Swiss-Prot record, chains A, B:
UniProt-listed Gene3D superfamilies: 2.40.128.20
Record note on what altering R30A does: Abolishes ligand-induced translocation to the nucleus
Species assigned in the record: Mus musculus (Mouse)
Outcome of swapping L91A: Abolishes export from nucleus
Record protein name field: Fatty acid-binding protein, adipocyte
Modification sites for Phosphoserine: S12
Entry GO MF terms: hormone receptor binding; long-chain fatty acid binding; long-chain fatty acid transmembrane transporter activity
N-acetylcysteine carried by residues: C1
Family indicated by similarity: Belongs to the calycin superfamily. Fatty-acid binding protein (FABP) family.
Residues annotated as binding a fatty acid: R126, V127, Y128
Length: 131, 131
């Protein structure tokens, strides 16, 4: 997963609001989240991968090992069970909570970092590029 | 995943034939497979986990890292894409091939090693115990 290492700036966002609405994000915070242009900083240290997101909305940080389930408090304050795998060359994270389930795909496409968030059909696409 | 390390003997098997039939295993080999009492030998060396199965049917060996997709030629000669994770304290392996998908769960239940194989509803249960 050395292809993901680095600092990335958000450059585009599509259907994010629809996605947040689906996960059950409140109207107010949903707008504050949408106006944010985060700086995802992926890093690795041994078998531990760390994805740090810095936004005007909320700074989050998750450190994990691949294929090993972990606990996470999402930005929208959901308490979920996560597991990240390197599937088909892409960092595939699936979040399970209250019987519900969302998947977050992080894949490289040229010089871009494409993030696909899926929740019951709805798909949000956010593209990043090296800062 | 140190709870899985060791040598294990098969002690029981339920609905295995139904499971094999579902994955598309031929009648003849399906019977030869069912008459086998394999010795699953799980081992670890650093970040590499190796599951060695020894049977009168066919000796298979897979070495892998958790959360990292790998190529595997199953005992019944299927060429699949596998990914093993430590989900909910259990070694959860999912095999993808030709649009189809089977999942193999390996969990500890007391002094036993329970293997649950699922393929479109059908579930096979094989219990092992330290040799």
């Amino acid at each position: 997963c050395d292809a993901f290492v680095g600092t990335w700036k958000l450059v585009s966002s599509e259907n994010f609001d629809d996605y947040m609405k689906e996960v059950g994000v409140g109207f107010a915070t949903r707008k504050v989240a949408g106006m944010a242009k985060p700086n995802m900083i992926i890093s690795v240290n041994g078998d531990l991968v760390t994805i740090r997101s810095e936004s005007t909305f909320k700074n989050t940080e998750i450190s994990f090992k691949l294929g090993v389930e972990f606990d996470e408090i999402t930005a929208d304050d959901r308490k979920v069970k996560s597991i990240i795998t390197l599937d088909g060359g892409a960092l595939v994270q699936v979040q399970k909570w209250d019987g519900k389930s969302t998947t977050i795909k992080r894949k490289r496409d040229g010089d871009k970092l494409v993030v696909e968030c899926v929740m019951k059909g709805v798909t949000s696409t956010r593209v990043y590029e090296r800062a």
